[PDB]
């Protein structure tokens, strides 16, 4: 059910979909073409079922990530931008919707980690990861602590661990190196080491999550953190006067957070391939396109450069865009659940003590290749169902040979 | 213990064993060495496990798919023909034989997919796929359809797919890269889509088998089939006026039908490696040899070049040499069972339209690695098995260790 | 936990290590540093464990195969001995303590496989291994068998195979190669060949396992074996006149014996590395060092140039260092656990006729490929077990929650 000469598009309760409709009236307007906008509870678990069938939105809007699934089964279509288009937004963002050297999705807007500081308590935010043991004990002397934040989780924990050499998948040619992997190298051991001192010096607790950090912070108990801007409606509520800016340098080295990006794809089995192209690069990712859904629902930091620098007066999106810039773009890959599997271990037996930051880092090249082949024997079992399964409409007790 | 001093050879029961008999007959004439011929059941099972013994029989007759897995294993030896005998035979069939580089067999006949149509209902046949479903809608005036071919197994519809560019596994400098899949690029999805489209145009069924296909032709149902030599004698025994040629182009580019070639391999536990290749060189691969064999039972297309051209008189076997020169030769690969395994799933799910095109191609790789991984995990329990027996019957319950 | 200050060592209890703390009571008085030597039962099995969590000894000492998997878990630090001092050992014992192109540990000791005679059935020793049929027909007229060793382990028969050209992995520039396996090919093939052809022209028997061939040497019923320095001990006490020499050569190549080499490594959580480093290579690698530990229990052949030359006057220790140079090292990879499982089938299936010699090669690679996979399931689900165990004690209800 694609229906020809219309078009259908997919987007996330929690974005702006009534201002995206708007944009959809506004090319009606001009080709007489109309553009229904649905957002179905768990679309991104949706689309890959109905997609393959042939079925589905022409357009999808989701992080880029889950889109490399989607082009592995070849349910995105290779989209067509020029030169030209392609200067419209920023260089960087373009590497995130790439899969085996085809562009499959149009970037629509960049969100990353950034460093998030209470005003009141420090007006003048640390430039460097290393001046903060310095100033917590200037501010357990006031009853407060310098920095907490989430350390279960690795998303959270890789800004620093990167900062100086650390890389899940080597980026080159167009394609990510699965035989290349950078948790072991020695600028990933500098990260970890210098978290785990942080740890046992008593500047940070081993047990920090995301409830307890955010909790904290607004609050008021502790003085930084670090978190994404989808925490910030809750700094909001708690009428701290909050700050946030670039991320602390590590060895003189900027911190490596993952961009996340929120892209628009062309489903492969749409019959209107053109008229979404017209639809995503001349009505919606232009000024008036974006604008109407940054109103309904912020979009956060832009792919779009023109658009980019008029959000960019809000400092808040600045810093958003500055540590994105300086992050590394989430690998699309599927190796990827190998590698989060892989690192939290690490990091949690890092930090508890159970292994040395040497040996933590070492077995997570071993942990990864284990994930690896439970997932390639996971998919080894369901196609030997599926293979069984057709072999009950052929021959049975319906037509044998 | 393959007894020195003569030659015993395998070679299939529906093959001319009798007439290869005479040739061993002639050989015995000629150099007083005699030769025994023997037609053992599933021959091809039987060999591996005879021959690692040392055992079986000096030269063995089989299709060279299943000569990779025996030179995998070792069982057949390095063949040494000079320059001047490769000549002899088509440089195409030579690949087939080759397995590491080494030579391990002799190229002795040809098999390939060819169109067959019905003279009557069409005396001139299309030489492009593109032509095809405007022929269909012209017959179906006259309640008859254009083509029925097996759509269930791959290697029938592989011409198609591989037509534009669709490949196995790339081959160069007489080696198989396993690393190079071509199910997935713009070549094999052009000849699949244009399939599916045939099949939603009501051209085609989808659940067309081998069977239906075979009773619609001899009935004289469609106008046109795809199939192989081994079912000319069904043909021949409904009396329907029938003619074998090459098979249609695919946006210009020709159809590249699988080449399985009947090859002759020398046992390497066997003593008589020079007896083996002087029979086969001088003996058999002439006009003579083939002869013998062909009156027997045809061979079909055959490797050498002179025997070759006489029975291209044939428009038939012309036509099945024809396309297997267009064609690609099987590859003789493990990996194979892979292939054949995901790409049966893809066309199935794409004619049924349970997938589309590009998805269905898509999940090929996916599905791949699932044999790959299967495979792996069914060798490597069987010889965790035979490791076992090792450590009782050696070391257990009458002794310690030893 | 590694205290620091001081120094503590662990070595196995077969070795001399009431010598070893004798060079360190000489370290102790001028440096003023105490030394601990330490021998716990299964040391190989504990120090993986303890070293992990930041435990163990500064220095390790064991044959260096085994510390191949102690780099890969990052148990052992990286050592930096100066182009001087590393031309005081033997220039391919270096090639054994070399683990990702980083040296890992310091080359103590050098063990390997020998051909040990009767002198009063033989003075003068078969130079090659074509003779040794030959020599077999006369010593059968006197009631005596020419040679039988061990053929039950790949271990004994692999010189013989290696010779012409077999070999496990390519050793390059930087490590091993896991892909150019030399078991296949012809040289290997014609090794192994030779040794089929003794056993069925009985000349040697393929059940001869270790035990029957010690007893028949010690009785004197055998005028030659194959055995490592090991053995000497009980050949002494049986009172037979015996002489060790080098190897025999197979078609005019010398005998490829594996190479076992012990080795010290310092402990990467150790905070002794400095003191490591100069107990080491000034105090225990020197002639007054080695001597010490050899006058408790004998070194057999030795890494260091200078001490070796003055062993070598025992004929023995001699042909043990001849045949190591003329041999190939042990590889450190943990691939070597898949290469022993499938020659020893190999051999085993090629002795008792069960295959023929190319049959029984071919099937190597994939008996071989069968227990890399094998490996690679436990290592998984070691994963899975230690995965759903950390995360229960870490995040649960009862008890907590
Ligand atoms: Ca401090
Ligand atoms: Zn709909
Ligand atoms: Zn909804
Ligand atoms: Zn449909
Ligand atoms: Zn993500
Ligand atoms: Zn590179
Ligand atoms: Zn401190
Ligand atoms: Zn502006
Ligand atoms: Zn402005
Ligand atoms: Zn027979
Ligand atoms: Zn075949
Ligand atoms: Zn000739
Ligand atoms: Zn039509
Ligand atoms: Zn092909
Ligand atoms: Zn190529
Ligand atoms: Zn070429
Ligand atoms: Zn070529
Ligand atoms: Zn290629
Ligand atoms: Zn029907
Ligand atoms: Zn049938
Ligand atoms: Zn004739
Ligand atoms: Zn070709
Ligand atoms: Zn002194
Ligand atoms: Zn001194
Ligand atoms: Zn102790
Ligand atoms: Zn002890
Ligand atoms: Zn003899
Ligand atoms: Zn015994
Ligand atoms: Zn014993
Ligand atoms: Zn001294
Ligand atoms: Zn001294
Ligand atoms: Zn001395
Ligand atoms: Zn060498
Ligand atoms: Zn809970
Ligand atoms: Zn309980």
């Given at each position: 059910?694609?229906?020809?000469?219309?078009?259908?598009?997919?987007?996330?309760?929690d974005?702006?979909?009534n201002?995206?409709?708007?944009?959809?009236?506004?090319?009606?307007?001009?080709?007489?073409?109309?553009?229904?906008?649905?957002?179905?509870?768990k679309?991104?678990?949706?689309?890959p079922?109905?997609?393959?069938?042939?079925?589905?939105?022409?357009?999808?809007?989701w992080?880029?990530?889950?889109?490399?699934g989607?082009?592995q089964?070849?349910?995105?279509?290779?989209?067509?931008?020029d030169?030209?288009?392609?200067?419209?937004?920023?260089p960087?963002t373009?590497?995130?919707?790439?899969?085996?050297?085809?562009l499959?999705?149009?970037?629509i807007?960049?969100?990353?980690?950034?460093?998030?500081?209470?005003?009141?308590?420090?007006?003048?935010?640390?430039?460097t990861?290393?001046?903060?043991?310095?100033?917590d004990?200037?501010?357990?002397?006031?009853?407060?602590?310098?920095?907490?934040?989430?350390?279960?989780?690795?998303?959270?924990?890789?800004?620093?661990?990167a900062?100086?050499?650390?890389?899940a998948?080597?980026?080159e040619?167009?394609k990510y190196?699965?035989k290349?992997?950078?948790?072991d190298?020695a600028?990933?051991?500098?990260?970890?080491?210098?978290?785990?001192?942080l740890?046992?010096?008593k500047?940070?607790?081993?047990?920090?999550?995301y409830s307890?950090?955010?909790?904290?912070?607004?609050?008021?108990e502790?003085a930084?953190?670090?978190?994404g801007?989808?925490?910030?409606?809750?700094?909001?509520?708690?009428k701290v006067?909050?700050?946030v800016?670039?991320?602390?340098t590590?060895?003189?080295?900027?911190?490596?957070?993952?961009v996340?990006?929120?892209?628009?794809?062309?489903?492969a089995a749409?019959?209107?391939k053109?008229?979404?192209k017209?639809?995503?690069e001349?009505?919606?990712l232009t000024?008036?396109?974006?604008?109407?859904?940054?109103?309904?629902?912020?979009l956060?930091?832009?792919?779009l450069?023109?658009?980019?620098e008029?959000?960019a007066?809000?400092?808040?999106?600045?810093?958003?865009?500055?540590?994105?810039?300086?992050?590394?773009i989430?690998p699309?890959?599927?190796?990827?659940?190998?590698?989060?599997?892989?690192?939290?271990?690490?990091?949690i037996?890092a930090?508890?003590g159970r292994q040395?930051?040497?040996?933590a880092?070492?077995?997570?090249?071993?942990?990864?290749?284990?994930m690896a082949?439970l997932?390639?024997?996971?998919?080894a079992?369901?196609?030997?169902?599926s293979?069984?399964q057709?072999?009950?409409?052929?021959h049975?007790?319906?037509?044998?040979?």
């Amino acid at each position: 059910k694609i229906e020809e000469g219309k078009l259908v598009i997919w987007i996330n309760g929690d974005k702006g979909y009534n201002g995206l409709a708007e944009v959809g009236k506004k090319f009606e307007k001009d080709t007489g073409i109309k553009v229904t906008v649905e957002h179905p509870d768990k679309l991104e678990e949706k689309f890959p079922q109905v997609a393959a069938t042939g079925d589905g939105p022409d357009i999808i809007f989701w992080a880029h990530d889950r889109f490399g699934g989607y082009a592995q089964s070849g349910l995105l279509a290779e989209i067509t931008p020029d030169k030209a288009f392609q200067d419209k937004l920023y260089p960087f963002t373009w590497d995130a919707v790439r899969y085996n050297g085809k562009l499959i999705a149009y970037p629509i807007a960049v969100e990353a980690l950034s460093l998030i500081y209470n005003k009141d308590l420090l007006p003048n935010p640390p430039k460097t990861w290393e001046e903060i043991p310095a100033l917590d004990k200037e501010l357990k002397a006031k009853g407060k602590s310098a920095l907490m934040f989430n350390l279960q989780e690795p998303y959270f924990t890789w800004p620093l661990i990167a900062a100086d050499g650390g890389y899940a998948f080597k980026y080159e040619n167009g394609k990510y190196d699965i035989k290349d992997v950078g948790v072991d190298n020695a600028g990933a051991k500098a990260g970890l080491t210098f978290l785990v001192d942080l740890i046992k010096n008593k500047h940070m607790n081993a047990d920090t999550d995301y409830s307890i950090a955010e909790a904290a912070f607004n609050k008021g108990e502790t003085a930084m953190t670090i978190n994404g801007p989808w925490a910030w409606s809750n700094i909001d509520t708690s009428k701290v006067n909050y700050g946030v800016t670039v991320l602390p340098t590590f060895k003189g080295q900027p911190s490596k957070p993952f961009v996340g990006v929120l892209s628009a794809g062309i489903n492969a089995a749409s019959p209107n391939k053109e008229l979404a192209k017209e639809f995503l690069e001349n009505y919606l990712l232009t000024d008036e396109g974006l604008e109407a859904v940054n109103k309904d629902k912020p979009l956060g930091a832009v792919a779009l450069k023109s658009y980019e620098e008029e959000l960019a007066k809000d400092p808040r999106i600045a810093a958003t865009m500055e540590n994105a810039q300086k992050g590394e773009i989430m690998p699309n890959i599927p190796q990827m659940s190998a590698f989060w599997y892989a690192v939290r271990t690490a990091v949690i037996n890092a930090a508890s003590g159970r292994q040395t930051v040497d040996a933590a880092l070492a077995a997570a090249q071993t942990n990864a290749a284990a994930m690896a082949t439970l997932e390639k024997l996971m998919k080894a079992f369901e196609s030997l169902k599926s293979f069984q399964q057709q072999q009950q409409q052929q021959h049975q007790h319906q037509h044998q040979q």
